[model samples]
Target: KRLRIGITLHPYYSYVSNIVGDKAEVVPLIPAGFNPHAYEPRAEDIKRIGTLDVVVLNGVGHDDFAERMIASSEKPGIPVIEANAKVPLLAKVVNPHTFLSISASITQVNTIARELGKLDPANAKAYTRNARAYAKRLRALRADALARLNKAPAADFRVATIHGAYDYLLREFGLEVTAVVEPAHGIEPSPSQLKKTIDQLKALDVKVIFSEIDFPSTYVETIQRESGVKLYSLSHISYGDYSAGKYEEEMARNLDTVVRAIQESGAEIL
Candidate 1:
């Protein structure tokens, strides 16, 4: 008789699991092996909505398809939690990778804990405590990553991305993306688009290119080859079976990857 919580994306799975722990059940609205980018909701996914007590949303751009399913499902008026309500968000193609960084995620974790606690008051304290613990542990993650860098980056070191999803993440390290290669999510560019992307990357003089991990693209390699920009990858946190440790495990690697890129940039400043 535990409360069943629905999550639209993979990172939320880890966030929900870490907060709710053994107190509740986590239900994935979408099954495994389907990409969240441009995904079409099927009948089976829409059908699962009736079993959830509350649904958590990225509420930005990443989970846009979620509302359609919820509206079409049995629980058309379900009390869904918009997890990004407390965070800074924008329209005109919103950047929805808040879960990709330590700081943004910690903020979301606190927001989620507070919101879920409002509904299930009996376990409110436990949820709050778990969220606090999760944030503390995540701070150490960012700390450990920063410890490797000799100093904060000079603030003008330009960088670029293969996808537009990583601005929130790059902000944690005082870096901003100079340009983006892909015009749309999961859709590789056409020949002209590819030439423009490569030209933009060349013009920007980007020190490194952050590509999406687990999303190997042929054009990504082409950018590296033609533009001579070193390639680094980050976990979008949008894949695989849900696990309590998925976010932490992948985040550590992502942080270290950023660290390595900066260190290399420092060395190549000839």
Candidate 2:
């Protein structure tokens, strides 16, 4: 029987698709447009799990839906492959958006390939080969992004995120998140909360703020207006059709957004 692998989020789907290629069947647990942070699996989705051999998930944060669904499903024995199981976590807080970083993403690809190989040893070699090829491509993407980022003046590297999602992305370029506006993923702040956040960013001297493409822009706009900070939209990589190319496309867009925003904002890259 062909291996039927389930994926909990779009990014995981993208990674698994690349690793498995045409060797196995990849299924997405959550359909497009569902907020991964707080998605609830329907009865059909759970039933669909019975047909899958295994499920690949973030296993840390983003795919809470999968955790709940797996626990409640009748086929509770379906194996789970945690992509982030061996990846190094970000400090100060746990950032579940590991797929946003090229290095971390490569780790996920390799992990998925390794685990999937264990489940279907018939094609173990193919999985490892595909993962290596994918990792090579990811490395090239990272180099290109880093080269572009290196062009900016050093001071511009210091920035803030509207949501905590980009901390992993920024760290790839030796950048640190100076401040974060949103207290949690997908949660909008109250007016007073926004005011407080704006003040915090101002105090930190953060000139650029990266906001998720899916997040409510009204809050970001308000922050920009109140704090005089330039806002850039980043792909949370949380939406869209599941495909191997989707990750590259969205992440490339995010890299472009980051570099362009810094250059346009006239901030030093250091």
Q: Which is the leading candidate under lDDT?
A: 1
Q: What is the lDDT of residue 233 in candidate 2?
A: 82
Cα deviation of 47, candidate 2, in Å = 1.2
Question: Which residue pairs in candidate 2 collide?
Answer: 153-268, 153-269, 154-268, 154-269, 154-270, 155-268, 155-269, 155-270, 156-268, 156-269
Q: For model 2, where is the 10-residue window of minimal lDDT?
A: 149-158
Candidate 1 C-alpha lDDT tens digits along 92-154:
567887788788888889998999899899999999999999999899988988899886665
What TM-score does candidate 2 reach?
0.93
Q: Give TM per candidate.
A: 0.95, 0.93
Q: How far does residue 257 in candidate 2 sit from its true spot (Å)? A: 1.5
Candidate 2, residues 63-167: lDDT per residue as tens digits?
888888887787898899989988998765477888888889999999999999999999999999999998998898877876775454366445888778887
Residue pairs clashing in model 1 are none
What C-alpha lDDT values do all the predictions have? 0.84, 0.82
CA displacement after TM-score superposition, residue 162 of candidate 1 (Å): 1.0
Model 1 CA deviation exceeding 4 Å by range: 154-156, 268-270
